[PDB]
Every structure is written in structure tokens, then in C-alpha cells.
């Protein structure tokens, strides 16, 4: 059977090398960070903090 197996083997080889990578870092982080804005200046007051 080794040549009918060889076509299934080739198809699985191509999918595995294109769908997979070796995990070197077992846990992955994701973060969410906020933002800020300027405002229009005035000659005597002061702007908001950040």
C-alpha cells in the first residue's frame, strides 16, 4: 500500500508544516492600555491631568 499511504502522508505533511509551530513559551500574555487627549489652552487656567 505504501504509495497510496505516501499520498495521504504527503497531504498531512504539507498541512502540518503550514498549520503548526513548536511552542517555546507555554503561556502568552495580552494587554489593554488606555489613552489621553490634549485640550485648548487659556491664558489664566490650567489643563486636566493624565
Amino acid at each position: 500500500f505504501a504509495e497510496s499511504i505516501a499520498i495521504y502522508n504527503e497531504a498531512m505533511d504539507n498541512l502540518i508544516q503550514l498549520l503548526t509551530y513548536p511552542v517555546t513559551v507555554p503561556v502568552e500574555p495580552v494587554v489593554q492600555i488606555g489613552e489621553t487627549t490634549f485640550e485648548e489652552a487659556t491664558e489664566l487656567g490650567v489643563p486636566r491631568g493624565a
Binding site: 489621553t36 490634549f38 489652552a41 493624565a50
Partner: protein, 50 residues
């Protein structure tokens, strides 16, 4: 005899500002990387302004 005439055009100018502020207890315990990140958020708010 002959007539002559001309005109001219101008542009506006405005001012913007922002503040940041810290208590002594924040500055006592903070990582410098946190205040550097607040600075980078202001530099990003500056581009989104202009």
C-alpha cells in the same frame, strides 16, 4: 488710462496644552517605565491633535 487692484489671504493660529501630575506617594513607589508610558501616550495624543 488704466486701473489696477490686488488682494491678500491669511491663516489662523491656536494654542493647546495638557497636564500630568503625581503625588509624592506615587513618585515614591512608581516604576520609571510607567511615567515613560504616560509621556508616550501624550506624544500620541499630540499627533492625533495635529
Amino acid at each position: 488710462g488704466l486701473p489696477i487692484e490686488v488682494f491678500q489671504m491669511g491663516y489662523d493660529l491656536r494654542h493647546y496644552d495638557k497636564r500630568n501630575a503625581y503625588s509624592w506617594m506615587f513618585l515614591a513607589d512608581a516604576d520609571g517605565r510607567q511615567v515613560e508610558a504616560i509621556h508616550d501616550a501624550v506624544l500620541w495624543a499630540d499627533k492625533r491633535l495635529v
